[PDB]
Write an enzyme that holds these catalytic residues in place. Structure first.
Site: not given
Ligand SMILES: Cc1cc2nc3c(=O)[nH]c(=O)nc-3n(C[C@H](O)[C@H](O)[C@H](O)COP(=O)(O)O)c2cc1C
Ligand SMILES: O=C(O)c1cc(=O)[nH]c(=O)[nH]1
Ligand SMILES: CCn1c(CO)nn(-c2cc3c(cc2F)C(=O)[C@@H](c2ccccc2C)CN3C(C)C)c1=O
Ligand SMILES: CCCCCCCCCCCC[N+](C)(C)[O-]
Ligand SMILES: [Cl-]
Ligand SMILES: [Cl-]
Length: 368
Positions: A189-190, A121, A227, A256, A187, A117
């Site tokens: 992505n910022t 944000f 985080k 993350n 993140s 992804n």
């Molecule tokens: C589509 C997507 C969006 C995410 N957006 C955020 C976010 O806004 N803030 C954040 O701290 N982590 C974000 N994450 C990270 C997840 O919270 C997590 O740390 C990461 O995906 C690893 O866990 P997983 O393998 O179970 O998905 C995002 C993950 C995915 C897949």
């Molecule tokens: O908004 C996102 O692109 C995002 C935020 C984040 O903390 N982690 C991530 O995988 N995506």
């Protein structure tokens, strides 16, 4: 069982079929809508006493939470508890509303049980989310008292000229509505965000955040967690640990998504820009938990996240030092029944390995 019935039908049939008909971001939006309406399979799993954990000033009925990113804007909190999560994290939320990156910005790697992804944000912003949480504030107070806490994950706007002020604004606006806050400095992505994990910038940022948190009235004063990324250098990890201890940060969320691309990825979309999640991240995340637990002497609660899709996956993170775990990506493949699956498998493993409950397993590897 009827449990393993739904698990199989979802994983083998329903999810792959629906995911084949939908764009990944459309799938995400539809999932939030259905969840918000409580249109969910039955979560037949009854949480056992073995799964309760007391950490961060709260009881958690079970140690399995929904990670940030699924419910960015706090639209589906109640439905996520109905799915059987022991705690819910919303966000990341930015101070002002912002659109995030252009579409497409979410990519499925089914051969890898992974996602990439680059949302960037996308957020409704603090005011919208504040009003959304206010509408259910007392409902949440009762949920939290009943062992179902709420976390709020804070981000920063793309164009912000003072990152620390964006986080401070989040503390002031959403802190009073949260059991814990997350300073998301990881993140991928910022632009420039992960530089906030560096020692000097981190100490200054976190000092400001904690001062704002400490200025909230007692019943509205959340725990503060940081985080972190799975891509940190050894130096970065040592520095974070040092800062966390010096300032008395309440916990860490580890990890993350990764900007790495582990050898062996098969999906056609493996070279898209963004954070990789799911199975390929799992062990990189577990080993980051292990290191951060050791560096903090086991004195700092860790929420372990990355590639959890089974009870074994959860228990490996707990034994490495996590007090709680989260998942997101597994839900995109398995659907809602994955929550009960993980809990059931975790309970079984705890019994098989001679642990009286989750608490006894926390950090157990370090004592071998
Ligand atoms: C589509 C997507 C969006 C995410 N957006 C955020 C976010 O806004 N803030 C954040 O701290 N982590 C974000 N994450 C990270 C997840 O919270 C997590 O740390 C990461 O995906 C690893 O866990 P997983 O393998 O179970 O998905 C995002 C993950 C995915 C897949
Ligand atoms: O908004 C996102 O692109 C995002 C935020 C984040 O903390 N982690 C991530 O995988 N995506
Ligand atoms: C990473 C973005 N992303 C992707 C694409 O990568 N998929 N995805 C999800 C889609 C989901 C779900 C959970 C998800 F995380 C559910 O839990 C599914 C569901 C089944 C039955 C009842 C109620 C529910 C809520 C429905 N589906 C789709 C089939 C629409 C998601 O966030
Ligand atoms: C977007 C996902 C589409 C599949 C939705 C499946 C919803 C099933 C849950 C409905 C409630 C269960 N009930 C009462 C019918 O047995
Ligand atoms: Cl308030
Ligand atoms: Cl990238």
């Amino acid at each position: 069982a009827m449990a393993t019935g739904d698990e199989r039908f979802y994983a083998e049939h329903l999810m792959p079929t629906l995911q084949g008909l939908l764009d990944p971001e459309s799938a995400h939006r539809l999932a939030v809508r259905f969840t918000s309406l409580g249109l969910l399979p039955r979560a037949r799993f009854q949480d056992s006493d073995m799964l309760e954990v007391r950490v961060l000033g709260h009881k958690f009925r079970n140690p399995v939470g929904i990670a940030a990113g699924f419910d960015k804007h706090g639209e589906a909190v109640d439905g996520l508890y109905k799915m059987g999560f022991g705690f819910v994290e919303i966000g990341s939320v930015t101070p002002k509303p912002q659109e995030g990156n252009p579409r497409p910005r979410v990519f499925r790697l089914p051969e890898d049980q992974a996602v990439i992804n680059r949302y960037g944000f996308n957020s409704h912003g603090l005011s919208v989310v504040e009003h959304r949480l206010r509408a259910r504030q007392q409902k949440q107070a009762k949920l939290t008292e009943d062992g179902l806490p709420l976390g709020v994950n804070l981000g920063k706007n793309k164009t912000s000229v003072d990152a620390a002020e964006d986080y401070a604004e989040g503390v002031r606006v959403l802190g009073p509505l949260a059991d814990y806050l997350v300073v998301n400095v990881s993140s991928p992505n910022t632009a420039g965000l992960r530089s906030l994990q560096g020692k000097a910038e981190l100490r200054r940022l976190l000092t400001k955040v904690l001062q704002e948190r400490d200025g909230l009235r007692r019943v509205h004063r959340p725990a503060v967690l940081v985080k972190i990324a799975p891509d940190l250098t050894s130096q970065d990890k040592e520095d974070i640990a040092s800062v966390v201890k010096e300032l008395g940060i309440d916990g860490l969320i580890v990890t993350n998504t990764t900007v790495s691309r582990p050898a062996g990825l098969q999906g056609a979309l493996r070279s898209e820009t963004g954070g990789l999640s799911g199975k390929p991240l799992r062990d990189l995340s577990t080993q980051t938990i292990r290191e951060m637990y050791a560096l903090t002497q086991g004195r700092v609660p860790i929420i372990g996240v990355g590639g959890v899709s089974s009870g074994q996956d959860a228990l490996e993170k707990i034994r490495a030092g996590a007090s709680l775990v989260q998942l997101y990506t597994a839900l995109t493949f398995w659907g809602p029944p994955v929550v009960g699956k993980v809990k059931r498998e975790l309970e079984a493993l705890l019994k098989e390995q001679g642990f009286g409950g989750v608490t006894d397993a926390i950090g157990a590897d370090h004592r071998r």
